[PDB]
Amino acid sequence: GSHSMRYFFTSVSRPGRGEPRFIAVGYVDDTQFVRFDSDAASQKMEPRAPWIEQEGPEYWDQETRNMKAHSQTDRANLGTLRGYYNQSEDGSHTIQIMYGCDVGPDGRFLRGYRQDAYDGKDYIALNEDLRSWTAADMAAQITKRKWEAVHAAEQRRVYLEGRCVDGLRRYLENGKETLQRTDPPKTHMTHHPISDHEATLRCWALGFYPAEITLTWQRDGEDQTQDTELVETRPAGDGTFQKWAAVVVPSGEEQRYTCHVQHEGLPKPLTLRW
């Protein structure tokens, strides 16, 4: 249905050897398609998906220019932030940036995002209305005033509601076979006794795309959060995801328990029983 394009930028200052390390990644939903690494011998925006390889050399030359300008600005902002927080040169610090857009099933703009961090803490963010900023601390207020004076929110909105949505729309058409797909999870259940009176029931979900999934254990049709372990959704490595949820049940009561699997790739949510 609805789709998203996100860009994740990381800049880490190296007080030791050389200028800061800059890493940039691009996602279309849960699929990576572009990458830029300052340490890599390439020094260009590199393709990570087969459908992005159909873009012209002007696209790759443009995207590289943007990444060089992104890294140099990040290198300058690392120094600016050191002064703002009154920190020494010997310490290693990080700048993280997130921006992108959401489109509906029809391809219409839904949401635009612009968020910045310093040392994994909120610094400055553009609000949902895309007109105002949210400054986390006193140091961020200095940045906010500078950006209000230069009308930065309007320039960010023009990108988010323009080239960002236009780019995402193009990528979704170019990569329909892989991006519009809904790979359902391959569900199975394991039973392992810990004693003669206790047993572990584990419900699996493998090979699914997108990553969004719900695994809920029930006892007599009532949600079971107690005596349950739900691991974080993890990448399999082939563009697909994995997740499991286990519950410790008394021996003989196995059939009172059900696992409910919700995924957009499933026509009806599954109900598994041992």
């Binding site: 300058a76 200095i142 940045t143 236009d166």
Partner: peptide, 9 residues
């Protein structure tokens, strides 16, 4: 596609 310029703090 990505932004052309990044703003200074």
């Amino acid at each position: 596609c990505t932004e052309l310029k990044l703003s200074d703090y």
